[PDB]
Design a protein around this nucleic acid. Structure first.
Lengths: 62, 132, 730, 180
RNA sequence: UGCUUUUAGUACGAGAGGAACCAAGCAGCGGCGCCACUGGUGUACCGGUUGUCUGACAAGGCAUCGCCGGGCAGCUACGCGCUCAGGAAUAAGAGCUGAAUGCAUCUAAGCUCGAACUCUGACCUAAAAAGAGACCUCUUUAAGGAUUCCGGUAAAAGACC
RNA sequence: AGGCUAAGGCGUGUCGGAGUAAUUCAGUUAAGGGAAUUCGGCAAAUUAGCUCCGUAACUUCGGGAUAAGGAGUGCCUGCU
């Protein structure tokens, strides 16, 4: 059972759910939900988005 | 043909102009028909990953252009599910020129191919640099 | 299941077995026995079918070292010694530490876990040794002592056992005494060796015999017994009883570190990027799953398999195929074949995890100074760069008239022979102006000529290659075509040093997408307008078309940029290449047709204009400097420092590492003449100096007119200053 | 039809449009030197001459190439064995459309005495060859030395489809005359 | 109803070429259902922001839900599950026995096989089947039903649960 | 112009309602494909203001022309 992490929110992909998104350059990103996929496609960054773990890490950097 | 492990929605229908992503000299090919596909009344021929289509080279070299060829779709934007429940989607649609047997006319494939096509036609997998 | 094939599998197991890796090396003074030890080590543990090695010098996998008897540069081989019923992969870092090497030394040392100091049993610790040892230690590379050539003492100089060990003891002493003066903190962390601690062996590479205190006991063979065999022609017995590989590999594994451990302190010392960064933790504590770390240190261009870059897998697993980057030159190349190094050859294997030098083909972004990465903009162990061009030229002549042909071909080979010069091979006068990178480099090459080819020739007074430079922002100068049907109002002004640097860096190019380039420039400094209106970059010159709405300029362009590049190649003053000059076109009166816009009319106007502008903007010269590094004794600093100061020695550091006053300064290339001599002369022969292109600098205005006049004369020009007046003719 | 375009026009007038027009109908643009840039900047995709005639190019601005059995392709009859042969070989292209004008020669007396050197060193050599070659093709390949008739050509192509004998003829005659 | 694997590079054939029974998976179309997953919608809801009004802030109105971004439930497909048969009796046809017609004959009686057909069989509907049904339980001023009340697995009204 | 508001004029011309089913008039949105629909791109969608750059064939020299094709644009602080 592959254990997968959401690229945007950093949450573990629950088995039997979630998406894998592949760009032209072979880059692969796990998405836990349509919300994370939409925010990734909008160009928003997780480190700037507060509800994600990367945004939380960026804020707690201070 | 050999069955694939994944469930593939036939996402590309006849008339779609897909970028050709090998070094054969074809830049854009328009789907004409789908091999081994029998339709129904009013339904356009449909193709998903792993399907072989008859295509016409719309852009590219003068030798490729206007030719009726066989191509295999290797990338599709429509999401398809693997057996273990994970959904896979590519950033674009992409095809590669092949023969009836499935051998690619090109020698290298720029971009990732789907594991489904990589297994259904093993030579596409070897020609491709990475299989996703 | 051939013995070799079983070893091959073992090889792979060990590859994914970082705890059982030993990336060791060999560090010694010239003619101490490096190559000897190396090859006879390979054969000693019999990794390959014996015969294979020897005759075909394996460790010497290149072509230069293959005729010397002592190691010269890098590459690597492999050993797998069985210790207390256990094998261990022993990578054998070839040693590019020969005094005739600068950065290369560092590079390899930053890939060597530890080394083996090999001290001639007679000649003892030597200058070379000192240098290498201290360097390596500085870059945290624990060594062990293998006093080779004992055979000489034992037989040749008919010394007695007791004396034998007295001399070797004195060596041991010297060894540590230096270690002490090198790094007391590491001498406190007990890296210092002693044969009683198994970190020192005794033997003769040329005879493949070698002992060490532990093994000694284990087998019963004592120094006196050794002496007996040697005196009684029993070196064969010696070898067999106590192998050379035996003792060496014992030091190499039992007391020398493995990737993991080595990597820790190594990263801490060499690397400077915050260790909390992923890449950091990865290469510190053994992790190849993280950002690719593969500092190419060698480019084994396999004639029948392409460019095979050999770098240590500090971080980055090598699963077949990987699109990646590198340090500095972080572009977009891939990674195809990744062979490991079995024997001295390339055994193709798949995934290589940690601490395992691998050779990778299909790597455009892969050379010395480039640490192939999969994380763009990778932090630096020691900052590096990539630019280096001839700045000191000499007019190689052919005194002996019965040598010209030979000379011609010899320098026709010199090109690839040493890719740092750019000879202007000519027939008009016969004077081959060889452009070297450094006065010393020049001297060296020139000497090599009448030595390895022996052309009875010499070289005349070295001269510095300057650049022409403008001073201020100029006032629109009209450049008129002969027929007057075209007018090119243009001005110039100094090129922003930031932009200069980045252009020389290469990133900013004219083959760059508008957006991409523009951005870079924009932040670097180039005012948005100009950044958007650039149309060409030449070395350190740009022609910013800042005009708008001028008919036929779109096409016209070419001819003007032609004139531009011409003038830039040789400025109106000292006829030297222009540098740090940015032009701004302000108006372009043009005739409607192309009849009166043919190149013969356009080119002149542009040229005329640009030159006139340059001259009106107080044309100066750029003198290159040459960053000096003087590895000298502590004590020695009085005359040294005063010397550089008298030679405009901008000291940027002095590293007074205990007994060593390693002064690091910057002195103008032109003024580096003689320094070579005086430095050592004064410092009683104790001054290991080294330099490197310190960047062009706005020549001190002090005697600008003087320097100018000199150039004028040498290159046979006119004595009337090339007054802008004339250039901007009627 | 006409699917290749080697346009190294010394005079860079009209090439922008012409090139776009071509690109639209297809016609791979294989120009080099000056033209190349101007087009690959205006937008018109252009391939460099580098990958046609066996060996690349040199001193852009006039020289460029001058390859025998590549000029012999375009030359005349690119579809008649013997002749056509020089438009295929080893990646060698069967270019069917050429337009390369010659900037007129001039002497430009310099302030410091006639610039004879430069003058002589700016007599286009490459141009005249390519030109006279294409020109030679009263049949197949079409040459357009003169820049002031890109319209006519484009027009015919756009509408009709293939160029017309009448035109090819005039074009050639004119091109030869220009080299004259 | 096709493709692929197997049978099998086998039978057949001098070669070239090249099958069939059985078995497996997949696919196209059709049918039925479902919403864990994925996609759409989601004028519940949350946020950003333009113009303006309520004096400012806050909180609100309006501009297609003002527009833009996201989206739970629900519905939905572009998603998902299930969707062989076997037997009987036959058509063409192939045979058995068998005289007329000593023999022979699939035929004149008689008999055995034999199709995606028909019937049966695994599905839906069906006491308004006028032969208008069977059985059991409860109770005969009761059993029980409806109405009112709170609802939804149902629902145009009714009905249903 | 359009939007939001004064003053002034009005709520003036059938209600209620439980998902208010199907269907229909008029709208919003819609994965992947993108005219394969159809007699025909009908209908719908795209673009869109202003500033700057740039603008072809052809031409009756007036034009074509907003041709085409690119870039910018909000708020705040201080200014010329």
């Amino acid at each position: 059972m592959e254990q997968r992490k959401c690229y945007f929110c950093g949450k573990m992909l629950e088995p039997g759910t979630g998406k894998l998104y592949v760009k032209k350059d072979g880059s692969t990103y796990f998405m836990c939900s349509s919300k994370c996929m939409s925010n990734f496609a909008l160009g928003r960054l997780p480190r700037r988005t507060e509800w994600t773990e990367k945004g939380k890490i960026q804020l707690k950097k201070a | 043909m050999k069955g694939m492990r994944s469930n593939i929605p036939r996402a590309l229908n006849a008339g779609a102009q897909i970028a050709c992503v090998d070094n054969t000299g074809a830049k854009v090919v328009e789907i004409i028909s789908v091999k081994k596909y029998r339709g129904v009344k009013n339904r356009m021929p449909c193709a998903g990953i792993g399907d072989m289509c008859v295509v016409s080279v719309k852009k590219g070299t003068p030798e490729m252009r206007k030719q009726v060829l066989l191509a295999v779709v290797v990338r599709q934007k429509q999401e398809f599910r693997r057996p273990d429940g994970l959904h896979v989607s590519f950033e674009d649609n992409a095809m590669v020129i092949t023969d009836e047997e499935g051998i690619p006319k090109g020698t290298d494939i720029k971009g990732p191919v789907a594991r489904e096509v990589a297994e259904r036609f093993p030579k596409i997998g070897t020609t491709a640099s990475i299989i996703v | 299941m051939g013995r070799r094939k079983k070893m091959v599998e073992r090889v792979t197991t060990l590859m994914n077995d970082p705890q059982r890796i030993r990336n060791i090396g060999i560090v010694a003074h010239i003619d101490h026995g490096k190559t000897t030890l190396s090859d006879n080590l390979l054969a000693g543990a019999g990794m390959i079918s014996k015969e294979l090695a020897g005759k075909q010098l394996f460790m010497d996998s290149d072509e230069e070292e293959q005729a010397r008897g002592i190691t010269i540069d890098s590459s690597n081989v492999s050993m797998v010694h069985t210790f207390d019923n256990e094998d261990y992969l022993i990578n054998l870092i070839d040693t590019p530490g020969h005094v005739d090497f600068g950065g290369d030394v560092t590079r390899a040392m930053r890939a060597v876990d530890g080394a083996v100091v090999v001290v001639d049993a007679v000649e003892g610790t030597m200058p070379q040794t000192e240098t290498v040892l201290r360097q390596a230690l500085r870059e945290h590379v624990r060594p062990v002592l293998f006093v080779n050539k004992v055979d000489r003492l034992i037989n040749e100089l008919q010394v007695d056992s007791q004396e034998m060990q007295i001399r070797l003891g004195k060596v041991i002493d010297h060894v540590n005494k230096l270690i002490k003066n090198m790094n007391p903190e590491k001498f406190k962390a007990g890296w210092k060796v002693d044969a009683a601690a198994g970190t020192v062996a005794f033997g003769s590479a040329l005879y493949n015999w070698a002992i060490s205190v532990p093994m000694m006991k284990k087998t019963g063979v004592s120094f006196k017994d050794v002496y007996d065999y040697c005196k009684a022609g029993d070196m064969k017995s010696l070898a067999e009883k106590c192998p050379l590989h035996e003792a060496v590999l014992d030091m190499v594994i039992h007391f020398l570190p493995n990737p993991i451990e080595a990597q820790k302190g190594r990263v801490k010392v060499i690397w400077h990027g915050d260790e909390n960064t992923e890449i950091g933790k990865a290469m510190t504590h053994a992790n190849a799953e993280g950002d690719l770390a593969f500092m190419v240190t060698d480019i084994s261009v396999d004639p029948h398999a392409g460019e095979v870059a050999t770098g240590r897998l500090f971080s980055g697993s090598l699963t077949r195929g990987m699109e990646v980057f590198t340090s500095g030159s972080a572009r977009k190349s891939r990674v195809q074949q990744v062979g490991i190094f079995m024997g001295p050859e390339r055994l193709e294997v798949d995934k290589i995890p940690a601490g395992n030098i691998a050779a990778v083909t299909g790597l455009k972004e892969a050379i010395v100074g480039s640490t192939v990465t999969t994380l763009d903009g990778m932090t630096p162990f020691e900052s590096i760069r990539h630019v280096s061009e001839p700045v000191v030229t000499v007019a190689v002549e052919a005194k002996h008239t019965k040598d010209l042909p030979k000379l011609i071909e010899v320098l026709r080979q010199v090109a690839k022979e040493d890719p740092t010069l750019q000879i202007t091979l000519d027939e008009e006068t016969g004077e081959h102006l060889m452009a070297g990178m450094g006065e010393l480099h020049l001297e060296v090459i020139a000497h090599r000529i009448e030595r390895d080819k022996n052309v009875e020739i010499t070289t005349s007074k070295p001269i510095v290659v300057y650049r022409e430079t403008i001073k201020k922002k100029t006032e629109p100068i009209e450049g008129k075509s002969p027929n007057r049907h075209n007018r090119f109002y243009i001005y110039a002004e100094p090129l922003d040093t930031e932009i200069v640097s980045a252009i020389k860096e290469g990133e900013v190019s004219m083959n760059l997408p508008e957006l991409e380039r523009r951005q870079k420039l924009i932040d670097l400094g180039m005012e948005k307008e100009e950044a958007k209106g650039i149309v060409g970059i030449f070395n350190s010159n740009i022609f910013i078309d800042m005009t708008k709405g001028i008919q036929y300029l779109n096409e016209t362009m070419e001819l003007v940029l032609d004139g531009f590049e011409e003038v830039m190649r040789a400025g109106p003053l000292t006829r030297e290449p222009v540098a740090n000059v940015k032009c701004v076109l302000v108006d372009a009166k043009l005739h409607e047709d192309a009849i009166h816009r043919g190149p013969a009319q356009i080119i002149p106007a542009a040229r005329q204009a640009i030159q006139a502008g340059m001259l009106m903007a107080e044309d100066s010269l750029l003198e290159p400097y040459q960053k000096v590094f003087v590895q000298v004794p502590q004590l020695l600093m009085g005359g040294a420092t005063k010397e550089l100061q008298g030679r405009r020695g901008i000291i940027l550091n002095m590293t007074t590492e205990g007994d060593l006053a390693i002064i690091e300064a910057r002195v103008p290339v032109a003024e580096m003449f003689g320094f070579a001599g005086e430095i050592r002369s004064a410092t009683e022969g104790r001054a290991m100096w080294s330099t490197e292109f310190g960047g062009f600098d706005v020549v001190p205005s002090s005697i600008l007119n003087d320097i100018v006049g000199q150039i004028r004369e040498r290159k046979g020009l006119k004595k009337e200053l090339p007054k802008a007046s004339d250039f901007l003719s009627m | 039809m006409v699917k290749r375009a080697l346009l190294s026009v010394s005079d860079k007038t009209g090439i922008t449009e012409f090139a776009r027009g071509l690109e639209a109908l297809g016609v791979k643009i294989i120009s080099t030197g000056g033209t190349a840039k101007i087009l690959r900047d205006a937008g018109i995709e252009v391939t460099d001459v580098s990958e046609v005639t066996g060996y690349p190019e040199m001193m852009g601005g006039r020289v460029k190439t001058l390859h025998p059995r590549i000029h012999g392709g375009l030359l005349c009859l690119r579809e008649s064995k013997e002749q056509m042969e020089e438009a295929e070989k080893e990646d060698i292209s069967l270019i069917d459309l050429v337009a390369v004008n010659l900037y007129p020669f001039e002497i430009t007396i310099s302030k410091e005495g006639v610039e004879l050197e430069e003058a002589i060193e700016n007599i286009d050599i490459g141009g005249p060859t390519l030109l006279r070659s294409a020109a030679k093709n009263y049949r197949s390949v079409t040459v357009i030395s003169n820049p002031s008739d890109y319209g006519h050509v484009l027009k015919e192509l756009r509408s009709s489809g293939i160029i017309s004998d009448k035109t090819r003829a005039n074009l050639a005659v004119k091109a030869f005359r220009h080299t004259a």
